[PDB]
Design a protein around this motif. Structure first.
Motif, short mmCIF file in Angstrom:
data_model
loop_
_atom_site.label_atom_id
_atom_site.label_comp_id
_atom_site.label_asym_id
_atom_site.label_seq_id
_atom_site.Cartn_x
_atom_site.Cartn_y
_atom_site.Cartn_z
N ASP A 29 0.84 -1.19 0.00
CA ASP A 29 0.00 0.00 0.00
C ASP A 29 0.88 1.25 0.00
O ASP A 29 1.49 1.58 1.02
CB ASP A 29 -0.93 0.00 1.21
N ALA A 30 1.01 1.88 -1.16
CA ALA A 30 1.90 3.02 -1.30
C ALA A 30 1.40 4.28 -0.60
O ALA A 30 0.46 4.94 -1.04
CB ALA A 30 2.15 3.32 -2.77
N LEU A 31 2.09 4.59 0.48
CA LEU A 31 1.84 5.76 1.31
C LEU A 31 3.18 6.18 1.91
O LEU A 31 4.17 5.47 1.71
CB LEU A 31 0.84 5.44 2.42
N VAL A 32 3.24 7.31 2.61
CA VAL A 32 4.50 7.77 3.20
C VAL A 32 5.32 8.55 2.18
O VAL A 32 5.18 8.37 0.98
CB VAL A 32 5.34 6.61 3.80
N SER A 33 6.19 9.44 2.68
CA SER A 33 7.03 10.25 1.82
C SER A 33 8.07 9.41 1.10
O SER A 33 8.69 8.53 1.70
CB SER A 33 7.71 11.36 2.63
N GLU A 34 8.27 9.69 -0.18
CA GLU A 34 9.24 8.97 -0.99
C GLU A 34 10.66 9.27 -0.53
O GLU A 34 11.48 8.37 -0.35
CB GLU A 34 9.08 9.34 -2.46
N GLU A 35 10.94 10.56 -0.34
CA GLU A 35 12.25 11.00 0.10
C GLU A 35 12.65 10.32 1.40
O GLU A 35 13.83 10.11 1.66
CB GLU A 35 12.27 12.52 0.28
N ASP A 36 11.66 9.97 2.22
CA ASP A 36 11.93 9.30 3.48
C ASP A 36 12.52 7.93 3.23
O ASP A 36 13.59 7.59 3.75
CB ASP A 36 10.65 9.19 4.32
N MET A 37 11.84 7.13 2.41
CA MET A 37 12.33 5.81 2.07
C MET A 37 13.68 5.94 1.38
O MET A 37 14.65 5.26 1.74
CB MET A 37 11.34 5.08 1.17
N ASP A 87 8.54 3.11 -9.10
CA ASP A 87 7.47 2.68 -9.98
C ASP A 87 6.23 2.33 -9.16
O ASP A 87 5.10 2.59 -9.57
CB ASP A 87 7.91 1.47 -10.81
N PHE A 88 6.47 1.72 -8.00
CA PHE A 88 5.39 1.31 -7.11
C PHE A 88 4.58 2.50 -6.61
O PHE A 88 3.35 2.50 -6.69
CB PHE A 88 5.97 0.54 -5.92
N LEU A 89 5.26 3.52 -6.08
CA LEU A 89 4.56 4.69 -5.56
C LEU A 89 4.04 5.58 -6.69
O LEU A 89 3.07 6.32 -6.51
CB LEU A 89 5.46 5.47 -4.60
N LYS A 90 4.68 5.52 -7.85
CA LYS A 90 4.28 6.33 -9.00
C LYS A 90 3.24 5.60 -9.86
O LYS A 90 2.64 6.20 -10.74
CB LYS A 90 5.49 6.69 -9.85
N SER A 91 3.05 4.31 -9.60
CA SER A 91 2.09 3.51 -10.35
C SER A 91 0.67 3.70 -9.83
O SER A 91 -0.24 4.02 -10.59
CB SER A 91 2.47 2.03 -10.29
N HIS A 92 0.49 3.47 -8.53
CA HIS A 92 -0.83 3.58 -7.92
C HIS A 92 -1.42 4.98 -8.05
O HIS A 92 -0.85 5.96 -7.57
CB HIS A 92 -0.74 3.20 -6.43
N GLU A 93 -2.58 5.04 -8.72
CA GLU A 93 -3.32 6.28 -8.96
C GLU A 93 -2.97 6.89 -10.32
O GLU A 93 -3.63 7.82 -10.78
CB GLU A 93 -3.07 7.31 -7.85
N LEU A 94 -1.94 6.35 -10.97
CA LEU A 94 -1.53 6.84 -12.29
C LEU A 94 -0.31 6.09 -12.80
O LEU A 94 0.80 6.29 -12.31
CB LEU A 94 -1.23 8.34 -12.23
N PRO A 95 -0.49 5.20 -13.80
CA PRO A 95 0.61 4.42 -14.37
C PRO A 95 1.60 5.29 -15.14
O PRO A 95 1.72 5.19 -16.36
CB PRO A 95 -0.09 3.45 -15.32
N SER A 96 2.31 6.15 -14.41
CA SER A 96 3.30 7.04 -15.02
C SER A 96 4.68 6.39 -15.04
O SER A 96 5.40 6.42 -14.04
CB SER A 96 3.35 8.37 -14.27
N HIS A 97 5.05 5.82 -16.18
CA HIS A 97 6.35 5.17 -16.34
C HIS A 97 6.42 4.32 -17.62
O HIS A 97 7.47 4.25 -18.25
CB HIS A 97 6.71 4.31 -15.12
N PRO A 98 5.31 3.65 -18.02
CA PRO A 98 5.30 2.82 -19.22
C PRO A 98 4.86 3.60 -20.46
O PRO A 98 4.44 4.75 -20.36
CB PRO A 98 4.27 1.74 -18.87
N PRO A 99 4.96 2.97 -21.65
CA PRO A 99 4.58 3.60 -22.92
C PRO A 99 3.29 4.41 -22.81
O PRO A 99 3.27 5.60 -23.11
CB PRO A 99 4.40 2.41 -23.88
N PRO A 100 2.17 3.78 -22.40
CA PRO A 100 0.88 4.46 -22.27
C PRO A 100 0.96 5.68 -21.37
O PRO A 100 0.70 5.60 -20.17
CB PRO A 100 -0.04 3.39 -21.65
N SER A 101 1.31 6.82 -21.96
CA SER A 101 1.42 8.07 -21.22
C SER A 101 1.45 9.27 -22.16
O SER A 101 0.45 9.96 -22.34
CB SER A 101 2.68 8.06 -20.34
N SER A 102 2.61 9.50 -22.78
CA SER A 102 2.76 10.61 -23.71
C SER A 102 2.57 10.15 -25.15
O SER A 102 1.58 10.58 -25.77
CB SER A 102 4.15 11.25 -23.55
#
Length: 102
Positions: A29-37, A87-102
């Motif tokens: 469950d992706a939560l918490v600050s990224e910079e922290d991890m 990818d995990f924290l950036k995936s949930h709520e928006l698949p920002s990383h794979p082809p399907p984007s721009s």
């Protein structure tokens, strides 16, 4: 030296423990600050490198060799951990990383 079991034992042990450290995360469950991890990852690496650096009684070659392998080993073990988290924290709520984007 060339390659003594002692060096492989220390390196493998450090690499194994590291893998357990990076994997022991809560990837679910992706939560918490990224910079922290991320800070935690870098913090550990530095702590490990600093400690390992003093855990070498071999010549500058043996020390440097083990030092370079340690750093490269951490980058390779940390790479999947940092990339997977991103990818995990950036995936949930928006698949920002794979082809399907721009």
């Amino acid at each position: 030296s060339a390659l003594l079991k002692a060096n492989k034992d220390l390196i493998s042990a450090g690499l194994k423990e590291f893998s357990v450290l990076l994997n022991q995360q809560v990837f679910n469950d992706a939560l918490v600050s990224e910079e922290d991890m991320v800070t935690v990852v870098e913090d550990w690496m530095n702590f490990y490198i600093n400690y390992y650096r003093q855990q070498v009684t071999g010549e500058p070659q043996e020390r440097d060799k083990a030092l370079q392998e340690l750093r490269q080993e951490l980058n390779t073990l940390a790479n999947p951990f940092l990339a997977k988290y991103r990818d995990f924290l950036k995936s949930h709520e928006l698949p920002s990383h794979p082809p399907p984007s721009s």
